[PDB]
Amino acid sequence: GSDNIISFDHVTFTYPDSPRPALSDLSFAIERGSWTALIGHNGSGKSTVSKLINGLLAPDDLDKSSITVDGVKLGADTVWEVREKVGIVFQNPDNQFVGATVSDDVAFGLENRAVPRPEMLKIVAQAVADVGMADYADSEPSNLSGGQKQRVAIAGILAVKPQVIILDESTSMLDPEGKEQILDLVRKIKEDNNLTVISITHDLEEAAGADQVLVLDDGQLLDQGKPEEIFPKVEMLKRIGLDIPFVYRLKQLLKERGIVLPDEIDDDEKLVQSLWQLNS
Amino acid sequence: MAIKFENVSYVYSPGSPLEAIGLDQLNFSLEEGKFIALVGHTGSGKSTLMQHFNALLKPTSGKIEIAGYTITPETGNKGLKDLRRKVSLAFQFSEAQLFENTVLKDVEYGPRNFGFSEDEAREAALKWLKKVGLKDDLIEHSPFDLSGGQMRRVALAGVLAYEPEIICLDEPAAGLDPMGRLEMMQLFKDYQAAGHTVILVTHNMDDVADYADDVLALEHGRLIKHASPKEVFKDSEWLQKHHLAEPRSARFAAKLEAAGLKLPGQPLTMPELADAIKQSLKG
Amino acid sequence: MYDSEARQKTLNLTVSAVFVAILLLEAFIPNVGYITILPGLPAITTIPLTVAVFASLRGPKAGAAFGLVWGLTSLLRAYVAPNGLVTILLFQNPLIALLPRLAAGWAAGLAGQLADKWEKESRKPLAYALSGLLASAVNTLIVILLSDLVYFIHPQKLALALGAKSGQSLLVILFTALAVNGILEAVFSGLITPLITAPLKKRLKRR
Amino acid sequence: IGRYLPGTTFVYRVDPRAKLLTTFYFIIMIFLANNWVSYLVISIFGLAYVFATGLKARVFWDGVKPMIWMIVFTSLLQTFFMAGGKVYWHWWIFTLSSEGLINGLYVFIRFAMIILVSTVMTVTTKPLEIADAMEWMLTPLKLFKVNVGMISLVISIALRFVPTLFDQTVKIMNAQRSRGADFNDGGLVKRAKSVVPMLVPLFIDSLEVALDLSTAMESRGYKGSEGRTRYRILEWSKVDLIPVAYCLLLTILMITTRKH
Amino acid sequence: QVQLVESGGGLVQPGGSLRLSCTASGFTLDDYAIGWFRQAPGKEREGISCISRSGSSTTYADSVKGRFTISRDRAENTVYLQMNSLKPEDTADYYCAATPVWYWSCAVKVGPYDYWGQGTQVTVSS
Ligand SMILES: CCCCCCCCCCCCO[C@@H]1O[C@H](CO)[C@@H](O[C@H]2O[C@H](CO)[C@@H](O)[C@H](O)[C@H]2O)[C@H](O)[C@H]1O
Ligand SMILES: CCCCCCCCCCCCO[C@@H]1O[C@H](CO)[C@@H](O[C@H]2O[C@H](CO)[C@@H](O)[C@H](O)[C@H]2O)[C@H](O)[C@H]1O
Ligand SMILES: CCCCCCCCCCCCO[C@@H]1O[C@H](CO)[C@@H](O[C@H]2O[C@H](CO)[C@@H](O)[C@H](O)[C@H]2O)[C@H](O)[C@H]1O
Ligand SMILES: CCCCCCCCCCCCO[C@@H]1O[C@H](CO)[C@@H](O[C@H]2O[C@H](CO)[C@@H](O)[C@H](O)[C@H]2O)[C@H](O)[C@H]1O
């Protein structure tokens, strides 16, 4: 008990066609205000987590499981309440665009919430600005890069003021500068709004920066902890099939060269200073 | 056999949309069996150049000499069937190509069109399916029953099964998790080792450093530099003035060196970087 | 399993939108599958195949609605961009452009209900083939039948000032062309529709 | 994307509903025209419209060019009336009613007019605006068991994906050609065969699109069409009177110069 | 559209009760989710309660949970806050805030609310 916004409790889920559960007795919390990352391989139960947090997928035994978002228990009567609280940027940049233009696409959620139009104009302008899309305020998605359309998705998510933003493989199809753009922007949004980010990813750099990293293996929670705690455990992740971020790899290689560095070093800047201090 | 662009210029009709970019007096020649990387910032001409290997877009000036074929501005579309049996394009997110009732039939498709028999194509698809790591029970599924990664492997089999002497891949690891991309690059390195030439068009500079042998740097339909990875990543000033990236181990080399560490040589890979750190630490 | 009717209702909406987008692409763009023996005469469209895929997917009332959209496309196009003389002579009429197409869509959805009703997986591709068949056949037949009631009986088509006798002989050449193209198209559409409908069931395994 | 160019002249200030209704009604009037006075009337009113937008000639030759050959086909088929070729007496014969070439100049007219006004609609109106106009026109269907809200949404999404699915449609074709697929080789026999490597991809694609869109839409609180505000609206303006003057005159000039 | 007016604050004895009222004027409250907040003299502003535009969802802080009850009066374009068992600590300035971007829910946080009233002061002691 430490002020968690999301608490996944005893969730099992079998895709309807598939024979086996995609998630088995999975329980985890999300510390309010954190940026935690979910990572996993082949078992890819994380691909199921976002659509469960927000309600698109139900669990298997609603009597035994319970998801809770911002104090609201996810149920039949509260699905929409909860979706106001948990906003999701999704993987494919196109196919997330409803509107024929940027501004229309941001306006969609306000419309869904019956926001009086004079408010909407102000809101859509502010969001589209906050993502640096005012040059393309009236542009058609067929003329926008994937980096832009991920920004525009982010913007429409922003206009509804959610309590948690999930990036559900949101950088996975983007050019690396686009990955940094989208990551920086969601960091800026998180600071400027005191939000929580759930990142569902295979970008180990992305998860390297998370306050918390949960490891998912075959639909169960293999391990969980700060990146400085999780990513040094090279053997565990290698067996799951996961890699590790660049810094933890360079540290491990240096170890295979004989040079041993501590676990707490977890940063480009920290490491540079470490090797600096060794040469003097 | 070696690829050669003779003053190759491709221009879209003048006065037409600017976002589709041409090729301006391209002059280079690729080696017969090595691994070439097509790099360039968005808006460069990679996609456009890549279609010339395929004779999808014929040039407007100069000649292209690929496989046994010469592709002039007047080359017709009749005999392309044999050039494409030799020179194969692998498009991006190619799981979209998949369409047959069985995985196996869709892999066989390529062979069939290029003149393999029933039995010849069946065996040629069954080989590469195993090469791309597909389980055996999925050989008779629909390609649409499979996951995105599996789908992508079936897409790649179907363009490699007829074993073209030249394969031009366009970002074949998009969306693949850390290890799957490693599998992808390993499979493509093995195919390079077997004696075929491989042109890889990618945004990840680390892939280039770890695997490429030669680099075509394209910018605004012009070749700006043509050389090995060790040479292209040598100058941070040049890249910064050309909006090009560096391998992350090269950036860490530069962070240590701007932080005054006497790292020897040009470390591009993580092993080379760790080595240079070890060699710089003592003496 | 939360607000299920909304999941399905919104998916209905999107499936409709993407099928309208494909229909507009097929109608206003000269698609590759658009095969013509003689340029400017009535050709074999891949459009009944599209109506049939969507009719099997969604249903008879939905297929009827898609057929009405198809016919509205043909009507708009007939006035605004006629491809040949068969469009100017026949498809500027709301009876001949709309009712046959709406009829085909309804029929194709009825046929798809069969494959819905047959549990064995192989025997579904059979019923899908029936739906591609009906989507081409009901369209071509009812276009001929209503061109008979509207324009043959009264060869005052305003197409031309063609002699009523000459108008009839022209309409007989036209209807024969319609029948021959319709048999070809009926078989093309009856073969290809299962090739599209079954992959779609596969890609739709979830929800 | 009907190649809508933006502009600032009064055509762009007319509410799209008025423009759609005027293009429909103007077409109707092209139909109820017969006497030479009525054709001079439709042509003076229509070319008045056309020179009133301000697009010079080059926009219109691009709009009409695909037609001009089927235009002259439908023109000569009409001039000769029944005969495909009027072998007997090749040239002019009568004086009081000259010849029947004037009749095929009416097909030149009717084609031109419907084309011209259709492109004014297409070039100077946003695709979503054209959509919103058609949706307004359908709003009377509410009195039946109809929901014009989801129809408007369908039209909007569709028009938004029309260029996206077109690009994907081209890319699949190039991928399959790169596997050595042939799309113009044999007769219909196998030219029919060659479509499946393009058709199964496109639907599989579009079904995935539909699935992702519904997933997102419900993610952002899409409960249906009833109960939701509207970001894009359509306000009538005083400029819109000008079309009324345009149309009532055309009624008055047509009906009274029309055959009695 | 901010003209929010709190009312009904004043002095009341410990264990007593009173009802605050948040009224709009020039716009309708139903277009806005309404949150009640409360800033003590030396504390930070504290979200205490709130109601959704649907009017179906309500949130209370653990401080006021079980004593305060919020309500939308559609007919009167007001949102009422009913404070019972008032304890000395409840004494503070009380503010109502409005934001349109939620229909089905509401949150008790200062950040998301865009339009505030000027606060009415409630004092409980004797
Ligand atoms: C120089 C000649 C070489 C030409 C190369 C030909 C390429 C190889 C063709 C093999 C088959 C591929 O094309 C294939 O067509 C047939 C018939 O439409 C389909 O076959 C399937 O459906 C058909 C008709 O619906 C049924 O009769 C049959 O039971 C089933 O197998 C396949 O689903 C399609 O993928
Ligand atoms: C002018 C261009 C048109 C573009 C838009 C048209 C595309 C429409 C595609 C068909 C509509 C989607 O499918 C729609 O959903 C279901 C069928 O599952 C039916 O559902 C309907 O039932 C009846 C209609 O008589 C009504 O009482 C009910 O309120 C309505 O929802 C609709 O009758 C059908 O129209
Ligand atoms: C005397 C009994 C009837 C004679 C036999 C049946 C002939 C049918 C006539 C043609 C079709 C009737 O069409 C119905 O009527 C009106 C005329 O007001 C149509 O109007 C339409 O038809 C005509 C025919 O090209 C066009 O010139 C007109 O521009 C078009 O809009 C309606 O769109 C339709 O609902
Ligand atoms: C209800 C309102 C609107 C209904 C009509 C919908 C029409 C839909 C057509 C949209 C076309 C898709 O987008 C389309 O892109 C391509 C190229 O990028 C262009 O069209 C392309 O095919 C044409 C066909 O002759 C070629 O001659 C041309 O060289 C090429 O550019 C179109 O000009 C553009 O509009």
B145 chain-C contacts, CB cut-off 8 A: 202, 205
Instruction: Give domain limits for chain D.
Output: 1-259
First-residue to last-residue Cα distance in chain C: 9
> Cα–Cα distance between A228 and A263 in angstroms, integer?
6
Binding site membership of C68 for ligand 2 (Cβ less than 6 Å): no
**Run of H or E including D135:** helix D127-138
Query: What are φ and ψ of residue A60, in 5° steps?
Result: -95, -40
Q: What is the token pair recorded at B166?
A: 């030249």
Q: What is the token pair recorded at B236?
A: 């941070």
Distance from the Cα of residue B1 to its chain's centroid: 17
> Cα–Cα distance between A5 and B121 in angstroms, integer?
56
- Could you give the 3-state DSSP secondary structure of residue D18? helix
A74 chain-C contacts, CB cut-off 8 A: 2
- Could you give the 3-state DSSP secondary structure of residue A10? strand
Instruction: Give domain limits for chain E.
Output: 4-124
Amino acid (one-letter) located at C175: F
Distance from the Cα of residue A159 to its chain's centroid: 18
> Cα–Cα distance between B33 and B193 in angstroms, integer?
8
Q: What is the DSSP letter of B12?
A: P
> Cα–Cα distance between B28 and B215 in angstroms, integer?
11
Q: What is the token pair recorded at A129?
A: 């600005």
> Cα–Cα distance between C144 and C154 in angstroms, integer?
14
Whether C and D touch, i.e. at least 3 CB pairs below 8 A, reads as: yes
Domain that holds residue A214: 1-280
Which of A263, A261, A264, A257 lies closest to A274 in space, CA to CA? Answer: A261
> Cα–Cα distance between D207 and B96 in angstroms, integer?
12
What is the residue-wise DSSP string for A189-239?
HHHHHT-EEEEE-S-HHHHHT-SEEEEEETTEEEEEE-HHHHTT-HHHHHH
Whether A and C touch, i.e. at least 3 CB pairs below 8 A, reads as: yes
Residue from D23, D170, D203, D213 whose CB has the most chain C CBs within 10 Å, to mutate: D203
D141: closest CA of chain A, how far (Å): 23
Q: Which of D155, D195, D204 sits opposite C199 (nearest CB)?
A: D204
Burial label, A32 (beta-carbon count in 10 A; 0-12, 13-18, 19+): middle
Q: Are β-strands E68-73 and E78-83 bridged in parallel, bridged antiparallel, or unpaired?
A: antiparallel
Binding site membership of C9 for ligand 2 (Cβ less than 6 Å): no
Strand arrangement of the beta sheet that strand E68-73 belongs to: E4-7, E18-24, E78-83, E68-73
Q: CB distance D200–B99 less than 8 Å?
A: yes
The residues pairing with E34 across neighbouring beta strands, listed in sequence order, are E51, E98
Identify the CATH assignment for E4-124 out of 1.10.3720.10, 2.60.40.10, 3.40.50.300, 3.40.50.720.
Answer: 2.60.40.10
Residue B71 in contact with residue B64, Cβ under 8 Å? yes
> Cα–Cα distance between B127 and B145 in angstroms, integer?
21
Spatial neighbors of C28 by CB under 8 A, at least 6 apart, are C73, C77, C81
> Cα–Cα distance between D167 and D206 in angstroms, integer?
12
Q: Are β-strands B166-170 and E58-60 bridged in parallel, bridged antiparallel, or unpaired?
A: unpaired
Using the Cα atoms of residue C157, residue C162, residue C167 and residue C173 in order, give the sign of their dihedral: negative
Query: What are φ and ψ of residue A186, in 5° steps?
Result: -70, -30
Q: What is the token pair recorded at D30?
A: 């092209």
Burial label, D239 (beta-carbon count in 10 A; 0-12, 13-18, 19+): middle
Q: What is the token pair recorded at D136?
A: 């307004």
Residue D107 in contact with residue D37, Cβ under 8 Å? no
Tell the residue nearest (CA) to atom 15 of ligand 1.
D193
Residue A239 in contact with residue A217, Cβ under 8 Å? no
CA angle (E24, E25, E27) in 5-degree steps:
85
The ligand minimizing its distance to the Cα of D147 is 2
Nearest CA in chain B to C206: B145
The ligand minimizing its distance to the Cα of B98 is 1
What is the residue-wise DSSP string for chain E?
---EEEE---EE-TT--EEEEEEESSS-GGGSEEEEEEE-TTS--EEEEEE-TTS--EEE-TTTTTTEEEEEETTTTEEEEEE-S--GGG-EEEEEEEESS-SS-----TTT--EE---EEEEE--
> Cα–Cα distance between A8 and E113 in angstroms, integer?
28
Q: Chain B contact for C206, CB < 8 A?
A: no
Q: CB distance D205–B99 less than 8 Å?
A: no
Atom of ligand 2 nearest to the CA of D154: 5
Which of A152, A161, D195, C69 lies closest to E103 in space, CA to CA? Answer: A161
Residue A39 in contact with residue A204, Cβ under 8 Å? yes
A117 chain-D contacts, CB cut-off 8 A: 229-231, 233
Spatial neighbors of D63 by CB under 8 A, at least 6 apart, are D115, D116, D118, D119
**Long-range CB contacts (< 8 A, 24+ apart) of B128-136?**
B128/B157, B128/B160, B128/B161, B129/B103, B129/B104, B129/B154, B129/B157, B131/B157, B131/B160, B131/B187, B132/B156, B132/B157, B132/B160, B132/B187, B133/B183, B133/B187, B134/B103
B206: closest CA of chain D, how far (Å): 27
Residue A124 in contact with residue A106, Cβ under 8 Å? yes
Q: What is the token pair recorded at A9?
A: 């409790």
Nearest CA in chain B to D206: B96
- Ligand 1 neighbours, Cβ below 6 Å, are B 100-101, 105, 112; C 191, 194-195; D 196
The residues pairing with A212 across neighbouring beta strands, listed in sequence order, are A36
Number of domains in chain B: 1
Q: What is the token pair recorded at B99?
A: 């369409």
> Cα–Cα distance between A193 and A198 in angstroms, integer?
15
- Could you give the 3-state DSSP secondary structure of residue D246? helix
